[PDB]
Amino acid sequence: IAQVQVQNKLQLAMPLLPQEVQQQGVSVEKSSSSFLMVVGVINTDGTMTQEDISDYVAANMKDAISRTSGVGDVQLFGSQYAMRIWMNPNELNKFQLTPVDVITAIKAQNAQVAAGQLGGTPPVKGQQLNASIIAQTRLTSTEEFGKILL
Amino acid sequence: MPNFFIDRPIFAWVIAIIIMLAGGLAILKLPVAQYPTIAPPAVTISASYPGADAKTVQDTVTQVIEQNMNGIDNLMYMSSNSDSTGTVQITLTFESGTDADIAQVQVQNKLQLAMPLLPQEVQQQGVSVEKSSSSFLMVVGVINTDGTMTQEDISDYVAANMKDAISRTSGVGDVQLFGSQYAMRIWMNPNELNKFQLTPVDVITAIKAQNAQVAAGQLGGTPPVKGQQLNASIIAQTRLTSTEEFGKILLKVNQDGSRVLLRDVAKIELGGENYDIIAEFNGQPASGLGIKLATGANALDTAAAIRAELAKMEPFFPSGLKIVYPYDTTPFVKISIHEVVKTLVEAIILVFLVMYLFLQNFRATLIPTIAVPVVLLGTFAVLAAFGFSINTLTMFGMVLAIGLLVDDAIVVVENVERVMAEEGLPPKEATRKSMGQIQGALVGIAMVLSAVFVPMAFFGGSTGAIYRQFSITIVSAMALSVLVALILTPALCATMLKFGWFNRMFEKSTHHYTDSVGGILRSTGRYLVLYLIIVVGMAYLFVRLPSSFLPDEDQGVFMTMVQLPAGATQERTQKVLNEVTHYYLTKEKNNVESVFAVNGFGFAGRGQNTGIAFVSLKDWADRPGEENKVEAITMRATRAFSQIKDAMVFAFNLPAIVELGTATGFDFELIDQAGLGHEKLTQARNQLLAEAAKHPDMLTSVRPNGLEDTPQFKIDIDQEKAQALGVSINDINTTLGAAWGGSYVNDFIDRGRVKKVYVMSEAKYRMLPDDIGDWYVRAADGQMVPFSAFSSSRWEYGSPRLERYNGLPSMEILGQAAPGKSTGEAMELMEQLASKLPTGVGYDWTGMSYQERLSGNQAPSLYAISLIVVFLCLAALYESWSIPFSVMLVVPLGVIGALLAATFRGLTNDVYFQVGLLTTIGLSAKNAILIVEFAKDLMDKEGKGLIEATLDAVRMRLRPILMTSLAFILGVMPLVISTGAGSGAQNAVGTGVMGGMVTATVLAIFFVPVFFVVVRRRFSRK
Amino acid sequence: ADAKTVQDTVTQVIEQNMNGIDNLMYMSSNSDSTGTVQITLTFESGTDADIAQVQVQNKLQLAMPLLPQEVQQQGVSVEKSSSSFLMVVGVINTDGTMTQ
Amino acid sequence: TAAAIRAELAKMEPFFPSGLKIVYPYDTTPFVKISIHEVVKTLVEAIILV
Amino acid sequence: GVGYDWTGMSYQERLSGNQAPSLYAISLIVVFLCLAALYESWSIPFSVML
């Protein structure tokens, strides 16, 4: 219940926190402050990095334990991956370009759009043939982000 | 206690009175519903992204809402659908006992905080978190009978006058609706609108200004100055309330004062929100309203109560609109509760008619009739004392126990006339002496029967709950009996006691029979060798008999399963529903009440593709033939339908507990577990599937419970091209969406209700790919560009339904046992088959085959502990690690016969038969308690002989057995075993008992005396 | 929002969902000319106010999305309400060094 | 709980990459097990000393 | 068309009153039964009750 009440009140503020903060994900937990245990993940093969494991572990093992009943909190000792657009300000300048530009770019070239379908839900006369119209797809590799048209 | 109670008498009654009062008083505080709450509790999150498609909905909504379901307590597993109508559904099934009222909070609260990461368009529609529990108290259906209202209009009336009316009605725990609510439709046209150089954006972002509503201020109000006379509230802009006000929307004006109204590019009019589910009731426009229970309410009370509120409002409907009931889970409960309560009334007369035909009174036989209805009314209070409800399960939980309730009554009042006759005292003084032979052995059948019952009520979950439903009812009745037979029946029959031809006509058969025992006991271990051949039969009778949950039953309705091929259309499916409608009406007009046909719903998925036919029948009365019932009509229809083209049309009868673990089948989940793709995961599944049909000796019907990949049309906006032209990705993407997907603009107030406004291209200019070019967007400079300038278009293979088990893309494949083998075997092969699949693919077990796993083999382990409590309990009743071993060997004598309903009918090993299998081991041991008690009573007290007592025990016993056994094999005889309708379990409840209660007696009489001697002569040595 | 265009547009929508909730005894709301809604659900004596609060928030949620944007991005609080103040600690300042 | 984390991970292991081990740096569970299994070990052996 | 109902204090008050001639009833019935019980007579209550 306490968790509930904390959260009803939080929820009233929610509309006031900067978009940037919501965007992250305001969390609300009911846990002990003590670590109950620490789960270590190594690479013997030397076949991966740390940079690689933080990510493996996150995309692959963190959600499970996170949803395990009784685990009121999980800390990841590291981080998951993200697409990283490590800007350079010279270049950005060379070609008359702010970071603003890069974002507004990354925004429209990296999207998922709903484009209805063919046998239109409320149809005509009488038609066979019905399939989804599929438009833009979110890029999925350093490779395509790289090809963004600036 | 009874001897220092026989006297009190007056007292008792009181007690009685009370018990009987409290019991009756509870019969009122009691809930009634077909079945009681037995599915693990679970919450579905549902969401919509208008005109989406799987991949989108899945990568844009579902994975979000999952990487968030965390910090929530008691999650068993979570499942997820992301189809291609733009709908996500996520269900989290919870641990068995978790309060569901707080499971839902925690979910929907950890959701509340993922929201901001959801697409602006989903956050509108609103994501829903309710309790998944499709146990439906009934589904009305408002139809109009004179083509004057449509699907959508009828929807509107229902949503505007009756929905709330019902929603606030004495019980109704949830009121869901079978249609829309009359959303404001505005159906653009590229042409009507290219001739102006307008996109849908100009339409969109211009409904938002015209149909808004802004704040203003008060006059005096907030801090004024001086003295002021007036304060009032300023009313600014406020929302349009008609299709006319929407027609007049200045979308633009060219140089000459041009009247470019919304009217002119589009087309306004009231219509549905959604438009791709078609409800029809016997060929007519339908739009019903489904309703759930209440939690602690009455299925009959509110059932009746709903019809009242409908009755009240029926003078209001204009153009003749009937209010039909193609599903009510009430007449089924009622003439199943009117039955059962008959079994009581009757099995009572059975103990009047027997008893009389044995003692021949009208004072002693009346005691039992007055004694039992007291034990019953009274258990109804202990039920209600544990929350329990009167329900199909708890109901039979007593009927299956009337045998044990009666036999206590008879046994007491019998052993008084086998004292006050056999050289005996008056009334009072006889009962007093008899409550010394039974006294101990009753408060000893009690503990014994507390075992072989309680160790039930302790099983897994989903099913384990159904069991408890019996246990608590029985063990409640059973123990409430012993209690009532130590206090009331002694003090009753000691204050009321002193057909014809009989007597000696029996008294020469007690002598004939007892000489089958003694005089034939010369060899001794003569018959024990036959008994090993009854055990060694039973142990073969088990393994053969098939397993089951709950005898599938005729309930008032059943369903047809239309399923058109890949790209098929709602229209194309209607015809296929039209045939079904016809066949069911025209060619079965004397069983079929109505077919409620809904196209757009279905089994494995939703879609323009499939539908489902809900068919309700005539009153089982008017369905007289045995083939006029359901198992037969489906027999027909099912096959009667495999005479249609591409349109797999099935038809099956619902399982008894509608919202529960169906087949004895398995539920298998193939999960991902590396960056393996859809495509990869498919190949993997397609292997397993293939590799599984190779073993029909072990699995039959391995199958995907999911849609297969279908084709799709990939519009593909060339960026550079658009950059070069004056046209922005934003205006592009909308316009495709807008036209084709439809979009939800703002709201407006039709008739004092808030109702949505949708905006979307007319059906004409949005059907075939060749239309894609129809549409233009205005670039930077102000010139319409056709999509072909900045698109390509290139047919490809997608997936209309994407699946996920516990946060990883799954693929649910469900298959059946095997004609011969056991579910546990099917599962276990299915696992070896899983085990040789391309690395990075895993399997998990869900649904039924999830409980089946966790719990599973337990029945032969809990009873391992009943038996140990029974022996340990029993031994103390006597005084030996030996004498009780004589009472237990009775067990099989009930099994066999009961187990011999593999023959005397064609049936299966199920919940019912098993509870019956307990009531039968119940009388059987309780008889062996009394017999072995006498053989120890007069052998201990009157000093009697090694085998003198054994003769004189069964001597004084043979009739008490015979009295009750005949009451029962006739009390269990009626519609119970050989029934018409509203039945099924009826046959199951009894057939177990009936024969098997035969062998429990007509075989335990020659046998248990033998049992008392095969111990003692072995225990004590020489 | 002005009462008629307040209630019915928000009040209805919430009110409309407040069905199911165990031991509901009597609901009663009122729109406002300021645009302010107060639905009150008072449950049977006995009744676990905390578990009562919880359902009144488990239903309210199904109403939420159907509510205006401004109404949403603002309030909507469900709280274990009473009616009568117990106390009124007032506060004045001696020596007109302070104001209303 | 730590039964179930250790149980979850279990069903997770089969599908890792090449040289990926779960190691156990820190954990309060075992002591608490070893702890009571010593107080109860005493419970026995001291009935052995009666 | 216009109906009514009590609320707050009223609804509580009303309820109190309607209950009473269902309260006195049971209470009596309980006493009566309690005498017959541990005073042995199906007749002395009949007379105490008077």
UniProtKB/Swiss-Prot annotation, chain B:
GO molecular function ontology, one term from the record: bile acid transmembrane transporter activity
Transmembrane helix is among the record's keywords: yes
Entry GO terms, CC: efflux pump complex; membrane; periplasmic side of plasma membrane; plasma membrane
Subcellular location: Cell inner membrane
Topology within the bilayer: Multi-pass membrane protein
Transmembrane annotation, as ranges: 10-28, 337-356, 366-385, 392-413, 439-457, 466-490, 525-541, 858-874, 885-904, 911-929, 959-978, 985-1004
Record topology, Cytoplasmic segments: 1-9, 357-365, 414-438, 491-524, 875-884, 930-958
Designated name of the protein: Multidrug efflux pump subunit AcrB
Gene: acrB
UniProtKB/Swiss-Prot annotation, chain C:
Disruption phenotype: Loss of susceptibility to contact-dependent growth inhibition (CDI); inhibiting cells still contact the target.
Gene: acrB
Record localization: Cell inner membrane
Complete-protein stretch covered: 52 to 151 of 1049
Induction (UniProt): Positively regulated by MarA, Rob and SoxS transcriptional regulators (at protein level).
UniProt similarity note: Belongs to the resistance-nodulation-cell division (RND) (TC 2.A.6) family.
Binding partners and assembly: Homotrimer, with large domains that extend into the periplasm, interacts with AcrA and TolC. AcrA may be required to stably link this protein and TolC. Interacts with AcrZ. Part of the AcrA-AcrB-AcrZ-TolC efflux pump.
Taxonomic superkingdom: Bacteria
Native source species: Escherichia coli (strain K12)
Function: AcrA-AcrB-AcrZ-TolC is a drug efflux protein complex with broad substrate specificity that uses the proton motive force to export substrates.
Name the record gives this protein: Multidrug efflux pump subunit AcrB
